[model samples]
Target chain A: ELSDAQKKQLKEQQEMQQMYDMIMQHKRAMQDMQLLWEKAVQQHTWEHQLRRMEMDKTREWAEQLTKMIGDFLPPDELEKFMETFKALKEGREPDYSEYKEFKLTVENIGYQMLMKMGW
Target chain B: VTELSDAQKKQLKEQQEMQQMYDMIMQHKRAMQDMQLLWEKAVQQGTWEHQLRRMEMDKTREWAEQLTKMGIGDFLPPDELEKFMETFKALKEGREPDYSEYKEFKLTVENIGYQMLMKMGW
Candidate 1:
């Protein structure tokens, strides 16, 4: 049983925690995207005679961009955006064979994370 | 200094509450901005990479499998065979197998079959 002031503080703390969790999830989603992009470029290099170094650089740039995005936002808003982004990404187009496998892996990871978070 | 009236105290309290609410709103807005940026980065890079990797791996796996089935042991060689076996083991383990690699491997074995059939004039 909390006093009025204690209850107010607890509520504020809970809100803050929720916001933090959302941001963390958002950041993770971006990281996942960065990995996906890098893998795509690598696959392209494999099929074509493109310079491996150039493709690798491009992949690196994509990863950097994801990190930059993560750095710019507050965690809670980031999480909200990530939830939407994941939904959109999953919904769009048929997944490639490898992507399908990757998605499965990601899904398992996401579920595990969610369970850990008590969500 | 003038003594504050009860009404003035109430007004000050309301002001404080309004300020707190405004701060909360601003925090939410900032959080949203962060999320949008994350979404953009992920969509631009991660989504494409994931899709491409899956497709390429599938093609490669198919090719490898095809070659093996066709008795193209000569073409697969020791190193290649070892790699194929490694991939096969992964698939057999039932732990999120690399479907693309498996597909490519299968295709490689099939290519060997086609060549053999050609040698036999069938």
Candidate 2:
């Protein structure tokens, strides 16, 4: 029979895998768009124009996906969160005291990108 | 309180790492949304130079392809690429090319045609 600790560990592992899958999907999308940018920059013709159109559509899709996470924090709180994140990413010690006012999801998403980008 | 076991410490560390990754992904998503909004505003305000930005250029792709197959691409400066393209296309269709207005670009247009002929072994 499985012990209680074993069951908890198994659950955490499954959740981790789910997050890993999400990160991989996002990484692939970014890489694909990056490739298009590289190709578009090479041509000074209509081909560049076509590639740019494709890129905008990709950007629109990205915006749509992120919109679901809807920003709930007020303007000042949001700014503080962003500032703290920027400081952390830059390897500087930041005052996270204002984060007390931030929604948990806001903090989670911010940390998600930092970890995904190796910041 | 009892000290945690090695297994517990390992599990705690893994949880922290996963939490960090989760936060970073969320931050990245927010940044992408920010970019989309910024681009939309820039496009709507014409603060960006590519005014005809989203308009499809494929309408002239067949003509462009014909030019491409003949070793021609966007060789002229802005406003001139389309002018040269229309002239080259007119010549190919056995019609007159309007050089009356773009007289300054006439030689450059001719130069393109001359290069096309050279590429075609004429």
Candidate 3:
């Protein structure tokens, strides 16, 4: 005897079986380091190495860039940069022109900072 | 006839596994995050009286118990775990967790994970 909510719960529970399979694969990757690759590049500078890694929408990717830039930015500047995105996350679409300007600021400052850190 | 090298086969299997894990984690992520928010709220709003009440509730009771041996990994950078622990410690001592520092700490955690991936050219 199951109501629609119970039926839905049962459906979710069924979907969870597939998810559990995924969790197991990920855990195995941890224990076995299956996902971890340790290959060498022929030769490269820090910038060369950085360029080699592809950047996408990954949080980890952004994290790496921010951490490096955070050190070089004026204390308030990096926080302000972060807050802009935070504001976006909180809702209201940012002014495209202003956001475009902010992106320029981040790129200009962030690149200069990266080179200062030896890139 | 085409033949796969051991390394090639190994990589294919590894990629498939990682994708699965990633998929699983993505599923129900909102629910898991909601749970974290509830946990954070209790920790953020902690007081001597509130702690007593929180401890009495099954939610806080189970959270603390599970946290000790939580399913976290090095993939979970230390900053995140440290921030989480620091907050938990503050709550255990009946103090409010610093929400501001937690914000910075999150970025710090993301950076470390980013560094790890970058080093591997991932």
Candidate 4:
């Protein structure tokens, strides 16, 4: 009994949700990789020496992934996101060497924005 | 020279154990560094994606809400809305912003750690 407009809106929402889910999955995968890499370094299984190289590669991969996601968004929206990210990133102290804190901050911001939009 | 030296052997064994402990500690330090790097990568990726999605949702909702508030729900038809969506997407994706400033800012922040680690010969 849905109108064409309602159906189209529903489809758009569904697509957005799918994209959100993909981002979540990617975050989880990165977490797992970090844990495993830490374990391997701790064990000193000859991979310890290669740690820096591995980390650099991972960082590059992340940069690329982020850029790819940015490509899907509208320019104004992308600029807003970048501005928020820069503000938060600049305001924070670099106490912990781990990136989890940064990730959490960004994710929380995203969640807040979503809630505000009634998403 | 002494014919036998029990204390000397004990001291040597203790020194070796200390060295082994030091090696383990060093290994753990490296492990921590590795973890930090991986975490940075993951966080960056997650943050980027989350921000992009939230921003898009916000813009769409804002437009829709404005229409609703104006009591013009029937003014914009399905085809119009679809066209608007397409236009919005096009506008958003048409130009890529220069992120060099942000990159430099991040690098400056990251440099503090680099300096600390360098002092440790890390």
Interface RMSD of 4: 10.9
State each model's CA lDDT, in order.
0.44, 0.43, 0.41, 0.41
Candidates ranked by lDDT: 1, 2, 3, 4
- DockQ of candidate 3 compared with the true complex: 0.04
Q: What is the per-residue lDDT of model 1 for residues B3-80, given as tens digits with 9 covering 90 to 100?
A: 779999877766665444334333433543454565557666635545444444444444444434433454343545
Residue pairs in clash, model 4:
A74-B92, A75-B92
Model 1 DockQ (Cα-based): 0.04
Residue-by-residue lDDT tens digits, candidate 2, A10-111: 776665555445544654564565456666666636554454444343333334336533344445345765665454445454332222222223323533
TM-score of chain B taken alone, every candidate: 0.33, 0.35, 0.31, 0.33
Q: What is the lDDT of residue B103 in candidate 3?
A: 36
Ranking by TM-score: 4, 2, 3, 1
- Cα-based lDDT at residue B64, candidate 2: 33
DockQ of every candidate structure: 0.04, 0.02, 0.04, 0.02
TM-score of 3: 0.26
Question: For residue B13, what is the lDDT in candidate 2?
Answer: 64
Docking class of 3: incorrect
The digit string of per-residue lDDT tens for model 4 on A1-119 reads: 99999998877776556445544565556556556666676676445434443344334434434542442233544564455445434543222223323333334333323222322
Candidate 3 runs further than 4 Å off: A1-17, A21-119, B1-62, B69-75, B100-122
